[PDB]
Amino acid sequence: MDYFNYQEDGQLWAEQVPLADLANQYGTPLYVYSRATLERHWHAFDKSVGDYPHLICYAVKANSNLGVLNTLARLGSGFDIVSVGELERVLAAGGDPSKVVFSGVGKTEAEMKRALQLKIKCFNVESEPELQRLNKVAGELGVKAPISLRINPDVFGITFDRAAQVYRLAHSLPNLDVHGIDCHIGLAPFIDATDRLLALIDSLKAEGIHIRHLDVGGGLGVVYPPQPSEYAKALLDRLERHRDLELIFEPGRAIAANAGVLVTKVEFLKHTEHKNFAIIDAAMNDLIRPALYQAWQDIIPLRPRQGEAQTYDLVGPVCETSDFLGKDRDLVLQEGDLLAVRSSGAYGFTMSSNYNTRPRVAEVMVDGNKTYLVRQREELSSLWALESVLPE
Amino acid sequence: NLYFQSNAMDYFNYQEDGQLWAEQVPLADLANQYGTPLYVYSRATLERHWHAFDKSVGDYPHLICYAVKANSNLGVLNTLARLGSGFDIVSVGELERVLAAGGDPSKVVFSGVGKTEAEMKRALQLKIKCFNVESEPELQRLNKVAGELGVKAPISLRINPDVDAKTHPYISTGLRDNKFGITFDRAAQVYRLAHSLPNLDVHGIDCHIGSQLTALAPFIDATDRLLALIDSLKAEGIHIRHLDVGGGLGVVYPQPSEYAKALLDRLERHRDLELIFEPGRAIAANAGVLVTKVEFLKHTKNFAIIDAAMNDLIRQDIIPLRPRQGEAQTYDLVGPVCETSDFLGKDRDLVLQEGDLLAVRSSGAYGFTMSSNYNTRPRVAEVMVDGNKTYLVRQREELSSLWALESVLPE
Ligand SMILES: [Cl-]
Numbered sequence: 001m002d003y004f005n006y007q008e009d010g011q012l013w014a015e016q017v018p019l020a021d022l023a024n025q026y027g028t029p030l031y032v033y034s035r036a037t038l039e040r041h042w043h044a045f046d047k048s049v050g051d052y053p054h055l056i057c058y059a060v061k062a063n064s065n066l067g068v069l070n071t072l073a074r075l076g077s078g079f080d081i082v083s084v085g086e087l088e089r090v091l092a093a094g095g096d097p098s099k100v101v102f103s104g105v106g107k108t109e110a111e112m113k114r115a116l117q118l119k120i121k122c123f124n125v126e127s128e129p130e131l132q133r134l135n136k137v138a139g140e141l142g143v144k145a146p147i148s149l150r151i152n153p154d155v156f157g158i159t160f161d162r163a164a165q166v167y168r169l170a171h172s173l174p175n176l177d178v179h180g181i182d183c184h185i186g187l188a189p190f191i192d193a194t195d196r197l198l199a200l201i202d203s204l205k206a207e208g209i210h211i212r213h214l215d216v217g218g219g220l221g222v223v224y225p226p227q228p229s230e231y232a233k234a235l236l237d238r239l240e241r242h243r244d245l246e247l248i249f250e251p252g253r254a255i256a257a258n259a260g261v262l263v264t265k266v267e268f269l270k271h272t273e274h275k276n277f278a279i280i281d282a283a284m285n286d287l288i289r290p291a292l293y294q295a296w297q298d299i300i301p302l303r304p305r306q307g308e309a310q311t312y313d314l315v316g317p318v319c320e321t322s323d324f325l326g327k328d329r330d331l332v333l334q335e336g337d338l339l340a341v342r343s344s345g346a347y348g349f350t351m352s353s354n355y356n357t358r359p360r361v362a363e364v365m366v367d368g369n370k371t372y373l374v375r376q377r378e379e380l381s382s383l384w385a386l387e388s389v390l391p392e
Numbered sequence: 393n394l395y396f397q398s399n400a401m402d403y404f405n406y407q408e409d410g411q412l413w414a415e416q417v418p419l420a421d422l423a424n425q426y427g428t429p430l431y432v433y434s435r436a437t438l439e440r441h442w443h444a445f446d447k448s449v450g451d452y453p454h455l456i457c458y459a460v461k462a463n464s465n466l467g468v469l470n471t472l473a474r475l476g477s478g479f480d481i482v483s484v485g486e487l488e489r490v491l492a493a494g495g496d497p498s499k500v501v502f503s504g505v506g507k508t509e510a511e512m513k514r515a516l517q518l519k520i521k522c523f524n525v526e527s528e529p530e531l532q533r534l535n536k537v538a539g540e541l542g543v544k545a546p547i548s549l550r551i552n553p554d555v556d557a558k559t560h561p562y563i564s565t566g567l568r569d570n571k572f573g574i575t576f577d578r579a580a581q582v583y584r585l586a587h588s589l590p591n592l593d594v595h596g597i598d599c600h601i602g603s604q605l606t607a608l609a610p611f612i613d614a615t616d617r618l619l620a621l622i623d624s625l626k627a628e629g630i631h632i633r634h635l636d637v638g639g640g641l642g643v644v645y646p647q648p649s650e651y652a653k654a655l656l657d658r659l660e661r662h663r664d665l666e667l668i669f670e671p672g673r674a675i676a677a678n679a680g681v682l683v684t685k686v687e688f689l690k691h692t693k694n695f696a697i698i699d700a701a702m703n704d705l706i707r708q709d710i711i712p713l714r715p716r717q718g719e720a721q722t723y724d725l726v727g728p729v730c731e732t733s734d735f736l737g738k739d740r741d742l743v744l745q746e747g748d749l750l751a752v753r754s755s756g757a758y759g760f761t762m763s764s765n766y767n768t769r770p771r772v773a774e775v776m777v778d779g780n781k782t783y784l785v786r787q788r789e790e791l792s793s794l795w796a797l798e799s800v801l802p803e
Contacts, residue, residue: 035801061730061767070800082730085768085791093800106687106697106728127697129688129746159692267506268529272569279506279527279571292706292733315571317506318482319461335529353764356461357485365801376797380485386787389470389493390435390776 002258003034003366004340012302012340016369019263019302023338026362027377028265029282031349033063035367037259038071038345044226045251046075052236053244055121057101059218059252060086062346067365067374068256069093078121080250084111087118097121101148101215101248103182105130105156112137112145122146124182124215126157131170138175148180148215151200153193157182163200171209178209180248184217191234198242215248222254253346260345262287263302264325266337267317276312278333283316284323285355287341287348291322298342299325305332314339318356349375357383400645402437402678403777404751412713412751414681416780419713423683423749426773427788429700430683431760433463435778437679438471438756445671446475448648452656452667455521457501459639459672460486462757467776467785468676469493478521480670484511487518497521501548501636501668503598505530505571512537512545522546524598524636526573528582531592538591547586548596548636551579553604554617563604573598579621580628587630594630596668597622600638602651612654619658622665635659636668643674673757680756683713684736686748687728694723696744700752701727702734703766709753710736716743725750729767760786765794 003015012019014032022032045056057078060069064086069079070093078099079090090100100120102111105127112134115123125131125147138145147170150157158166170176183197201211221229228236239245264282271277289295299314309330316323325341352360359378364371397405403415412419414432422432446456457478460469464486469479470493478499479490490500502515503524512534515523525531525547538545550573557564568575574582579597586592599618602611622632641652648656659665684700710725720741727734736752763771770793774786 064768066795066798066800074801083728083767083769085765085770085794088791089768089795092795104728104730105690105726106699106701108687108699127688127690129690129697133688156695267508268527268533270527270529270571272575275569277571281506281508313571315505318504351764351766353762354485355762356483357464357489358483359485363798367801372799372801374799378797380488383485384466384489384492386789387466387774388783388785389466390474390778390783390785392474392778 002037004261004342010303012300014261014366017366017371019261019340020338022364022371023263023265023302026364026373028263028338029286029361030263031260031344031361031363032263033065033068033260033345033363033365033374035071035365038068038255039075041255041259042072042075042077044222044224045249045255048222048226048228048232049247050236052239052247054247054249055099057099057215057248057250058255059250060090061350062252063256063260063348063350064089065349065363065374066093067363067372069095071365072255078248084114087115087120091118107133109133109137113141116141116143116145122148122179122213124148124150126150128166128169131166131173131176135173135175144175144177146177146179148182148213150182150184151197153183153185153189154196155189160196160200164204167204167209168207178211180213180215181211182215182217184219186217186219186221186231187234190231194235194238198238201242201245211245213246213248215250218250218252218254220249220251220254257343257346260348262341262344262348264339264341266333266335266339269333269335276310278312278314278331279317280314280325280339281317282325282341283318283356283358284320285353285358286361287325287344288351289347290325292351297326297344299329300340300342301331302338302340305334307332354383359383402753403434404681404753406715410714412711414777417777417782419681419683419751420749422775422782423685423713426775426784428683428685428749429704429772431680431755431772431774432683433465433468433680433756433774433776433785435471435776438468438675439475441675441679442472442475442477444643444646445669445674448643448646448652449656449667452660453663454667454669455499457499457636457668457670458675459670460489461761462672463676463680463759463761464489465760465774465785466493467774467783468679469495471776472675478668484514487515487520491518507533509533509537513541516541516543516545520546522548522595522634524548524550526550528574528585531582531586535589535591544591544593546593546595548598548634549574549579549582549586550598552576553599553601553614555604555606555614556610560606560610563606567604576617576621580625583625583630594632596634596636597632598636598638600640601655602641603638608650608654611651615655615658632665634666634668636670639670639672639674641669642671677754677757680759682752682755682759684750684752686744686746686750689744689746694721696723696725696742698725698727698736698750700736701729701767701769702731703729703764703769704772705736705752705755705759706762707758708737708755710740710742711751711753712742712744713749713751716745716748718743768794770794
């Protein structure tokens with residue numbers, strides 16, 4: 001599943017690099033990514049589709065570190081971006097703009113212009129007012145903007161019953177070209193919505209509105225010669241006759257989640273009448289998923305100890321009730337022990353802040369037995385370098 | 393203008409021209425000059441609330457230690473330092489902010505359950521007022537660092553309040569098993585340990601007596617027991633000079649809460665304990681608004697897609713800078729992030745047109761302090777108004793700086 005495994009010496013390694021070595025060299029907390037894990041997951045997705053025309057558009061928001069993006073860009077990956085910042089990251093990482101699709105409900109005129117100038121693949125439009133703005137901007141630039149409409153399955157996009165009308169509007173707007181349909185179908189409803197979607201592509205085709213690609217979003221869906229999920233399998237089988245509809249997938253978490261761990265150190269162990277607490281050095285500003293959402297992430301020792309385990313809540317170092325990484329974890333701990341939080345490669349560093357004026361941590365990439373720093377730990381004083389006191 | 397408008401909470405109010413003003417500066421002008429989204433703070437609002445709190449205790453020896461984490465902008469901190477405020481910090485970064493803002497380190501208390509040796513060393517070097525120690529292992533670490541520097545660390549122990557288990561079993565169980573502090577029954581023992589260590593110097597007790605939702609009677613008995621402990625420790629040679637009661641014991645708008653008054657009635661007999669309060673939201677919350685622009689009005693349910701996202705404000709009344717005449721419609725205000733949790737308000741009645749500017753009230757605390765770059769979005773500008781003057785207190789981040797510390801794979 002991934003390359004974070006214990007080796008013969010009894011400790012946890014990332015590929016061929018001991019995690020403890022990285023903690024020593026770069027300090028804690030620390031995000032560590034595995035190049036091989038990212039590549040193995042991307043290829044599983046890329047190859048599961050078969051010869052069917054497709055494009056994997058990695059969801060940049062999941063993990064947008066330049067090293068991570070560069071890894072995927074070298075494989076020829078596409079990218080799904082939600083801002084001009086993400087588009088600039090893709091370009092800095094060597095990504096191909098012709099393989100970029102731009103999503104998001106609040107795209108600005110400035111963002112649309114930069115994307116049009118870079119000639120991205122498609123704008124995934126979520127509303128009629130957005131469609132109007134993209135038409136205005138493309139006209140001002142004297143170009144034609146490639147679009148897809150985000151549609152919602154019949155049960156945040158446009159409803160199925162207004163889809164035809166909004167597509168006809170896009171078709172009548174002078175500065176837009178209709179290219180795709182975006183439907184985040186990711187089991188009975190999935191299939192039912194897929195048919196209604198294909199029927200819509202056909203009816204539009206009769207009207208001279210030609211959809212060339214279908215974007216099915218993320219939340220899929222590789223079964224491991226890796227095969228697609230029953231969901232994807234159900235779709236591919238219905239697309240033999242329906243061609244040459246290029247299929248676009250937007251995996252994020254599926255590629256990046258298990259490719260990263262957060263290494264943290266146990267500062268203090270505290271005991272109450274019925275509970276035990278391990279105070280760790282990673283806080284809500286470093287990894288917010290458990291606090292914000294109700295995410296359960298496996299927490300394991302870099303060097304497991306023998307003996308009777310005690311049940312601990314793992315809590316951060318500041319002063320918040322939601323400052324914790326895990327609850328009710330049976331572990332054998334001593335102060336100073338290092339832990340790894342699995343599944344921290346997605347929605348980990350991307351959501352990190354400077355809350356409590358804490359510098360963001362370093363991000364490191366392993367590649368066999370080599371280690372590359374891909375994001376330096378922030379220098380403390382840089383946190384307020386843009387600020388000013390009152391002159392009074 | 394004798395009829396200059398105000399409200400009980402802040403200086404963000406409408407005037408003769410039909411628009412929302414921040415003190416004597418139109419919010420619309422600031423949005424025009426600095427862009428949106430924008431955090432706008434009111435100097436007079438911060439001062440009003442800090443003074444209301446400072447005056448509530450009257451003549452009794454005290455220190456207000458503002459909770460820096462609520463809003464640690466240098467301009468905000470400087471406003472308070474100018475009034476002689478103290479500060480409660482939870483990291484070395486917050487300590488450095490206070491120093492850069494002109495604050496007095498001898499009025500700084502350092503809280504937090506996971507202070508590092510490095511943080512303790514710097515805090516000791518700057519001679520802060522006191523370390524609010526949350527566990528025995530932390531007490532040992534501070535003794536170690538103080539021992540290495542050959543100095544005496546000033547300490548206060550965070551002691552859970554002595555709730556009576558017979559009358560408040562659930563609260564008692566909750567307190568005793570929480571991650572914060574040391575249980576009341578262990579207080580004397582851990583104080584004796586601190587007393588035995590020559591590189592520690594016992595100065596206080598940190599007991600957040602009003603933080604448990606409790607009636608006046610139980611609060612008072614619990615307070616009496618805390619005071620009796622202080623006395624028993626004193627007779628035993630361990631001299632506590634200050635009591636830090638934490639946050640929440642606010643003011644009723646301008647006299648103190650009945651809780652605050654009961655406490656004061658007991659402290660005023662001896663008057664040998666300096667009282668420390670740690671307000672944060674109570675000082676900063678209403679001193680700020682987040683100004684945001686409506687991008688699109690999407691109708692299905694109605695959605696006003698605004699330019700402020702979860703990365704800007706993750707936590708509130710939402711009002712127009714320039715109210716329109718018409719029949720208000722109901723909207724959910726949602727940001728641009730591709731997340732279901734990316735919203736600022738649900739079901740709000742407003743008369744809107746695309747491009748309109750809105751102000752999100754009560755955004756001065758836990759607003760910018762929690763802002764991130766999620767979706768590679770630069771953090772916004774922070775401006776402070778002072779009468780008719782405008783001060784830029786945090787520049788908007790330049791987009792390319794977001795990945796300046798990063799690198800690609802070797803070639
Ligand atoms: Cl303890």
